[PDB]
Structure formats: C-alpha cells, structure tokens
PDB file of C-alpha atoms (C1' of nucleotides) and ligand atoms in Angstrom:
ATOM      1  CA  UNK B   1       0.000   0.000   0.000  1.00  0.00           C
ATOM      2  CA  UNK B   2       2.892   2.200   0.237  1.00  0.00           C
ATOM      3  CA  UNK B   3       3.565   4.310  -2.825  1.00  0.00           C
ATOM      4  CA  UNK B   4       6.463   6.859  -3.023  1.00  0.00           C
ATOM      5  CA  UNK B   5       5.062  10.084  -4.788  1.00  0.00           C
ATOM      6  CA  UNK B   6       6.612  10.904  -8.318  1.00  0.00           C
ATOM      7  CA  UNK B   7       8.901  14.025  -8.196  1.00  0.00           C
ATOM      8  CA  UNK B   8      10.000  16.585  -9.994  1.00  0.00           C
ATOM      9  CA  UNK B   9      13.072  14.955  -9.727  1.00  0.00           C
ATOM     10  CA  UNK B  10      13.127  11.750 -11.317  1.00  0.00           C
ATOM     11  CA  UNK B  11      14.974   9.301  -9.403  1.00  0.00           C
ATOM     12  CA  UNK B  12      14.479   6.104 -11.019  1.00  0.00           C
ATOM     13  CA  UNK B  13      14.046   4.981  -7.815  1.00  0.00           C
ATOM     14  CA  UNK B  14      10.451   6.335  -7.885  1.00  0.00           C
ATOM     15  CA  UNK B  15       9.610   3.673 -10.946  1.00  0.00           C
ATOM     16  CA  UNK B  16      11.224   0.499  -9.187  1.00  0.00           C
ATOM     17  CA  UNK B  17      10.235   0.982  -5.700  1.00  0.00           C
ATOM     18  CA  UNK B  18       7.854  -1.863  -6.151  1.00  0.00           C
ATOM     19  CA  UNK B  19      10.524  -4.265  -6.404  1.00  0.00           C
ATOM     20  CA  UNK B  20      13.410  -3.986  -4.182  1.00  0.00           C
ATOM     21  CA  UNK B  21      15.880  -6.271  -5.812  1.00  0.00           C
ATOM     22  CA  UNK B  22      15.249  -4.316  -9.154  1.00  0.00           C
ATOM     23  CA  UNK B  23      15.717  -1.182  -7.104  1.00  0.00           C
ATOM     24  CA  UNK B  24      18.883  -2.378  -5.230  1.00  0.00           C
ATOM     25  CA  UNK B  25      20.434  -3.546  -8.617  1.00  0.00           C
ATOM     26  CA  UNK B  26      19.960  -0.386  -9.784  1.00  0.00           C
ATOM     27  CA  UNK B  27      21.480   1.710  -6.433  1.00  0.00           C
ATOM     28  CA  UNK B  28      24.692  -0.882  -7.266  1.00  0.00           C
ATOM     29  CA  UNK B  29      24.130   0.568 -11.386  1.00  0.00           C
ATOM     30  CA  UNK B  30      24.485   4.388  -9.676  1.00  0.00           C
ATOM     31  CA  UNK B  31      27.838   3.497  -7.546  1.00  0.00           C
ATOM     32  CA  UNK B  32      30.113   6.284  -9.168  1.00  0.00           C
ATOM     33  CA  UNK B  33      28.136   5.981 -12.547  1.00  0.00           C
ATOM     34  CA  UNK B  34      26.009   8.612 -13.929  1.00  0.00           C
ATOM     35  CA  UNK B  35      22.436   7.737 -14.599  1.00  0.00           C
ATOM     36  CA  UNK B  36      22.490   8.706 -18.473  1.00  0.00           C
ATOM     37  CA  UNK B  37      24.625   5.963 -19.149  1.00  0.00           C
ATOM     38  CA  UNK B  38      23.750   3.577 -16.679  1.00  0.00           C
ATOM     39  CA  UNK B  39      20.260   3.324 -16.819  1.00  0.00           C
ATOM     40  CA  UNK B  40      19.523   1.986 -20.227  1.00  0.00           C
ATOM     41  CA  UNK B  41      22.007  -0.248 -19.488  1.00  0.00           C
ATOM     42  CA  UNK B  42      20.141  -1.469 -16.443  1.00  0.00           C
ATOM     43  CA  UNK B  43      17.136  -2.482 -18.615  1.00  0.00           C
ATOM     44  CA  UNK B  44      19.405  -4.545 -21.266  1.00  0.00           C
ATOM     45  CA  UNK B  45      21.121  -6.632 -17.632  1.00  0.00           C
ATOM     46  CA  UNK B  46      17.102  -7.045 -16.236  1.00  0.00           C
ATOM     47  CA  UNK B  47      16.053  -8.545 -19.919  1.00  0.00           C
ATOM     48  CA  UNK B  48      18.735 -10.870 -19.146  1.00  0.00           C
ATOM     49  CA  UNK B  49      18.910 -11.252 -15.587  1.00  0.00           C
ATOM     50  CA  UNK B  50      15.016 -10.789 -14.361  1.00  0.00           C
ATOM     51  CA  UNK B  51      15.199 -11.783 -11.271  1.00  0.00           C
ATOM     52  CA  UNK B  52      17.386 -12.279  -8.138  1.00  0.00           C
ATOM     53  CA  UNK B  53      16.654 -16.573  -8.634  1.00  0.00           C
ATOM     54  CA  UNK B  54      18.607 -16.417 -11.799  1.00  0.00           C
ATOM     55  CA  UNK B  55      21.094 -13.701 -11.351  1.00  0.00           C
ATOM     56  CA  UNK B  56      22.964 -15.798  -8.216  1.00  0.00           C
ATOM     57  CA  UNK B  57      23.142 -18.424 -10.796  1.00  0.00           C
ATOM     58  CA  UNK B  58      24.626 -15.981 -13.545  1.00  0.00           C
ATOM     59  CA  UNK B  59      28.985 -16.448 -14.602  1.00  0.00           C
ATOM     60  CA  UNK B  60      29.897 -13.047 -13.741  1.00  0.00           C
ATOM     61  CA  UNK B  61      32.179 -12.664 -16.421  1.00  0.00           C
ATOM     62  CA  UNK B  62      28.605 -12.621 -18.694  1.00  0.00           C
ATOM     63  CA  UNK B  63      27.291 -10.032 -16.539  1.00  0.00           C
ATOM     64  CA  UNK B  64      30.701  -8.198 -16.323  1.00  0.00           C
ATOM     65  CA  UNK B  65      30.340  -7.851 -20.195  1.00  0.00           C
ATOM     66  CA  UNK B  66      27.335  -5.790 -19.996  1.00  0.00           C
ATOM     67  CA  UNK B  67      28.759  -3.901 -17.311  1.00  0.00           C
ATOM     68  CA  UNK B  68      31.870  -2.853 -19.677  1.00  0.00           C
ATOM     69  CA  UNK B  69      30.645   0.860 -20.635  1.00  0.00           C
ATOM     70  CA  UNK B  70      29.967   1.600 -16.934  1.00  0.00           C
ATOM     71  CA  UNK B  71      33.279   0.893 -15.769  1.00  0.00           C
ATOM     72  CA  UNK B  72      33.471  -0.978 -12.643  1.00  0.00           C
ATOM     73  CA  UNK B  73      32.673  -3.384 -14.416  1.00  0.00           C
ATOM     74  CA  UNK B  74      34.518  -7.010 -12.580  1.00  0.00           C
ATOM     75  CA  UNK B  75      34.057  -5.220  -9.373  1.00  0.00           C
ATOM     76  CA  UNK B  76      30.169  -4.907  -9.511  1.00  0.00           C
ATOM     77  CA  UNK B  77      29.314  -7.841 -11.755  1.00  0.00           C
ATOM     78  CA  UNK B  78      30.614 -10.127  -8.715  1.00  0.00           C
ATOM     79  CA  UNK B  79      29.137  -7.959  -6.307  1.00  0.00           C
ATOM     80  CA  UNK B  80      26.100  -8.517  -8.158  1.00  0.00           C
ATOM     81  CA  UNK B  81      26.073 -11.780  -8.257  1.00  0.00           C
ATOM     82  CA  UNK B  82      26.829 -12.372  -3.983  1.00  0.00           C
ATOM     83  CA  UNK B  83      23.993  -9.422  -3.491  1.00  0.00           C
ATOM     84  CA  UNK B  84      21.837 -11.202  -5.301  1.00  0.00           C
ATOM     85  CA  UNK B  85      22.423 -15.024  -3.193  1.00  0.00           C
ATOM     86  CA  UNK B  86      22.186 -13.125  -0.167  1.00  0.00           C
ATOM     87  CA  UNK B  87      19.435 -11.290  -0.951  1.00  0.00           C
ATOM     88  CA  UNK B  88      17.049 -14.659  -1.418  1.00  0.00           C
ATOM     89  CA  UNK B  89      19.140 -16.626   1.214  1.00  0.00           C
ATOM     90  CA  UNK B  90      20.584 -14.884   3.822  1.00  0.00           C
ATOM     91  CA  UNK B  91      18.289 -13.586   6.764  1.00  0.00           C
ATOM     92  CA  UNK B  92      17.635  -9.580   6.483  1.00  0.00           C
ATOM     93  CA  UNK B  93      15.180  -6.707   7.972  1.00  0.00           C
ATOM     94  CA  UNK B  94      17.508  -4.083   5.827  1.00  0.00           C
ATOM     95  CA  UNK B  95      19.295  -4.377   2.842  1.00  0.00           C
ATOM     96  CA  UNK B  96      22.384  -2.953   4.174  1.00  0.00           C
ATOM     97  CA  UNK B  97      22.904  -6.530   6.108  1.00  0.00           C
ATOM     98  CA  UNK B  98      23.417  -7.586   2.063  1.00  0.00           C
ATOM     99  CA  UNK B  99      27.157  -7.953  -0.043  1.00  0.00           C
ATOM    100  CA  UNK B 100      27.246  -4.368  -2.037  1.00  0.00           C
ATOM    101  CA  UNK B 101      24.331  -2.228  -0.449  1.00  0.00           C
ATOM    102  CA  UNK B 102      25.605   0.519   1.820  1.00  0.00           C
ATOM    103  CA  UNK B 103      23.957   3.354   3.075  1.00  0.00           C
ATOM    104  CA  UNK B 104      22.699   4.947  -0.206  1.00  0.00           C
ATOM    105  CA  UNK B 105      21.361   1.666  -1.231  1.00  0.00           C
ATOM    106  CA  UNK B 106      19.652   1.162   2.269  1.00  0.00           C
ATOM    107  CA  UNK B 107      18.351   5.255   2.555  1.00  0.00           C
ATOM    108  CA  UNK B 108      17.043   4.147  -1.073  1.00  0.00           C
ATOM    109  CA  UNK B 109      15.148   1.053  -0.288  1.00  0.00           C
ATOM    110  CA  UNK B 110      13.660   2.666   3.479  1.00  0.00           C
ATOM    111  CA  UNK B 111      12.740   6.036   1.261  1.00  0.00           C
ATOM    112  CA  UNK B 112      10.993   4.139  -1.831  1.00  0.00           C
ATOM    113  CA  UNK B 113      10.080   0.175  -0.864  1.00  0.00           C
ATOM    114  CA  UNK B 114       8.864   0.505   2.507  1.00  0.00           C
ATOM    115  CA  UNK B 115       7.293   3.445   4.310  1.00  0.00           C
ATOM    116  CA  UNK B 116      10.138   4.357   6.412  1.00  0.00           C
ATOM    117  CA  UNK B 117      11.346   7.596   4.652  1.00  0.00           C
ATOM    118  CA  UNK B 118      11.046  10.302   8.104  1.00  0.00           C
ATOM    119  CA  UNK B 119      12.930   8.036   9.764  1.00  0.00           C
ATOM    120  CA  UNK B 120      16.118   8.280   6.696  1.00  0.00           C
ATOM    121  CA  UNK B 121      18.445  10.939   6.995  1.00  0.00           C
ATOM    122  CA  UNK B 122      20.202  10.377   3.526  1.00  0.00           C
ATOM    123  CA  UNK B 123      23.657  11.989   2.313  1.00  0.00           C
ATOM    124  CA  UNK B 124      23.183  11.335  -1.366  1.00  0.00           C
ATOM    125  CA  UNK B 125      22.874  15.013  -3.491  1.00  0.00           C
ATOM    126  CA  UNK B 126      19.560  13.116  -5.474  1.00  0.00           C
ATOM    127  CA  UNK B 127      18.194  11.571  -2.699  1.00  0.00           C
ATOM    128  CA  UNK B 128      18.169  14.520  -0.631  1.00  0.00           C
ATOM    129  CA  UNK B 129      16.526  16.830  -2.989  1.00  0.00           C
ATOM    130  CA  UNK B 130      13.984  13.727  -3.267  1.00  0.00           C
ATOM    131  CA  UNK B 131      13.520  13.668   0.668  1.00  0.00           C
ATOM    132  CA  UNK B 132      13.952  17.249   1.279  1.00  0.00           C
ATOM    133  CA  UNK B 133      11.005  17.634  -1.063  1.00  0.00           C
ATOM    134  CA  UNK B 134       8.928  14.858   0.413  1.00  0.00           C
ATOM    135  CA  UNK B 135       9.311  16.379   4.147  1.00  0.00           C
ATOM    136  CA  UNK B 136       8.176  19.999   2.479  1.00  0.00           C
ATOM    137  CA  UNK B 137       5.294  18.391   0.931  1.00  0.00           C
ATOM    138  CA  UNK B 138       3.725  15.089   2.359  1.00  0.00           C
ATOM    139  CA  UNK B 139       0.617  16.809   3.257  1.00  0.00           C
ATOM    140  CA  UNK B 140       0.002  18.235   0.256  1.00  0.00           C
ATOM    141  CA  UNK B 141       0.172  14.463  -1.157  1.00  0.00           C
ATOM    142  CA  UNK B 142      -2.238  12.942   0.899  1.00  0.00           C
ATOM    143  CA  UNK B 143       0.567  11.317   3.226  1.00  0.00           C
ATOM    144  CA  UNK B 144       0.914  10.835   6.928  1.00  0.00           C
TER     145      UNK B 144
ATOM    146  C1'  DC U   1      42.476  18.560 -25.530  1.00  0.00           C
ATOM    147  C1'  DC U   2      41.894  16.498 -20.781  1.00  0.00           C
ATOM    148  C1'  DA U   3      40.965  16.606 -15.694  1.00  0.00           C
ATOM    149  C1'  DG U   4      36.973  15.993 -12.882  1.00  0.00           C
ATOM    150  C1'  DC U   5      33.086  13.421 -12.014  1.00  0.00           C
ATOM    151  C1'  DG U   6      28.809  10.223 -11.785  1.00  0.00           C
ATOM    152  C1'  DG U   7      29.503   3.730  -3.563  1.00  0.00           C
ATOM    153  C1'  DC U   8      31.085   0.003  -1.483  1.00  0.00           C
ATOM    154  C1'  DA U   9      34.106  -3.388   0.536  1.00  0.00           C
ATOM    155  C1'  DG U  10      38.322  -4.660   2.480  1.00  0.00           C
ATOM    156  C1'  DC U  11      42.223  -3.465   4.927  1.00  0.00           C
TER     157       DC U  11
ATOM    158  C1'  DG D   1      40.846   6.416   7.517  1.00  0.00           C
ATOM    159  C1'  DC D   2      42.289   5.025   3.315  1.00  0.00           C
ATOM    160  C1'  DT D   3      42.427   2.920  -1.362  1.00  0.00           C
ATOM    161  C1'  DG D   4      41.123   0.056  -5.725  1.00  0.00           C
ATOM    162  C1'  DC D   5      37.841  -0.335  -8.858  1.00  0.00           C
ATOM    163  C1'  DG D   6      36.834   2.259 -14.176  1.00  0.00           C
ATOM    164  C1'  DC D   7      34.034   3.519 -18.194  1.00  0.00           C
ATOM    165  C1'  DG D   8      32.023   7.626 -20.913  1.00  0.00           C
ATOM    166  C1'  DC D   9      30.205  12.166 -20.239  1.00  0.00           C
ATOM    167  C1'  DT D  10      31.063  16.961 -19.357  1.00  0.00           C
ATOM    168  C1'  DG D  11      32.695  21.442 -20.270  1.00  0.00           C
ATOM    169  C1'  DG D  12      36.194  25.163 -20.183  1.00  0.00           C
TER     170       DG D  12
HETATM  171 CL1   CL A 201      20.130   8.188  -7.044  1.00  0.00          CL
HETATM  172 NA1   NA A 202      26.050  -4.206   2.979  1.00  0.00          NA
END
DNA sequence: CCAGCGGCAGC
DNA sequence: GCTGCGCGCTGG
C-alpha cells in the first residue's frame, strides 16, 4: 500500500520501488556511474537477468560484459552476483545486512520500498533533494 | 584537448 | 581512515 510520490526529480528509484531487488540492482548501477549511461544499461542486464533466482546463478564474467561501458565493471558484476544469493538466502530486515548495499542503497530502499522515509536521513545530493522535497510536501500528497 | 566526475568493501 | 575499482560524459 505504500507508494512513493513521483517528483520533480526523477529518481528512477520512484519507478522500481515496487521491487526492491530491481531497485537495489539499480542503487549498485548508480555506484560512481552517472544515470544517463547507466540506466539503459540497467534495462538490457534485467532482460537478461530478471530476477534475483537467476542472477545468483549468472557467470559473472557474462554479466561483467554488460557492465563494460559503466566501468566498474569485474568489481560490480561479482558484487552482483553475492547481493543477489544473499538477498534470497541470507536472513535480512535491511538491505544494508546484504554484499554491495551501503547506506545509499539502504536510505534508497527505506525512502521508496517501505514506508520508512522520516525516519532516513540520507547523504546522497539526489536523494536529498527527493527527501527534502517529500518532508516539504507530504501533506500536500495525501501522506501521513 | 583532458581533468573531474557520476559507492562500497576490504584493509 | 584510506584505497582500488573504471568507463564515458562533461565542459572550459
Ligand atoms: Cl540516485
Ligand atoms: Na552491505
């Protein structure tokens, strides 16, 4: 039932909220990346990779490939492979317990997947302007 | 032309 | 605290 308003902003973030691995993956996407380059990328790694179930499964050197333009592209293709085991095995309330989600990941998923976002205090120049924006206007939204 | 810039883990 | 990872975009 939670739903994270659309901004004027748009943090992509705001579209995947409804899944969290498909929002995490793309927090690990934004890790020193711009958006305009790796977003579209994001899509072509989800049309391969749907799911976390087959993504801890996945050779990382196949998702490294796709990861090539990014940069960081070893790095985060085996991160993204761990994230994604832990994510369906290991025991979590937070996604900062998981391999390659740190605090901008974690302010992410409490801001957009669950209704936790006055309780975030993010450091993150987009998800600030997203929160700051949110305090200054959840009544106006019909919001609590 | 080319230096600065768009998180996280491991130590 | 500190460093390695790393591509393409950006803009003077
Ligand atoms: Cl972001
Ligand atoms: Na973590």
């Amino acid at each position: 039932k939670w739903t994270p308003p659309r901004s004027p902003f748009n943090l992509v973030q705001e579209t995947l909220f409804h899944d969290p691995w498909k929002l995490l993956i793309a927090t690990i996407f934004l890790n020193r990346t711009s958006g305009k380059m790796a977003i579209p990328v994001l899509w072509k790694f989800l049309e391969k990779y749907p799911s976390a179930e087959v993504a801890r499964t996945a050779d990382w050197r196949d998702v490294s490939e796709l990861l090539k333009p990014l940069g960081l592209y070893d790095l985060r293709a085996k991160t993204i492979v761990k994230f994604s085991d832990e994510y369906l095995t290991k025991q979590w309330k937070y996604p900062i317990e998981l391999h390659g989600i740190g605090k901008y990941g974690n302010d992410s998923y409490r801001i957009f997947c669950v209704n936790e976002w006055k309780q975030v205090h993010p450091e993150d120049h987009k998800l600030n302007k997203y929160h700051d924006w949110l305090w200054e206007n959840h009544e106006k939204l019909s919001l609590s």
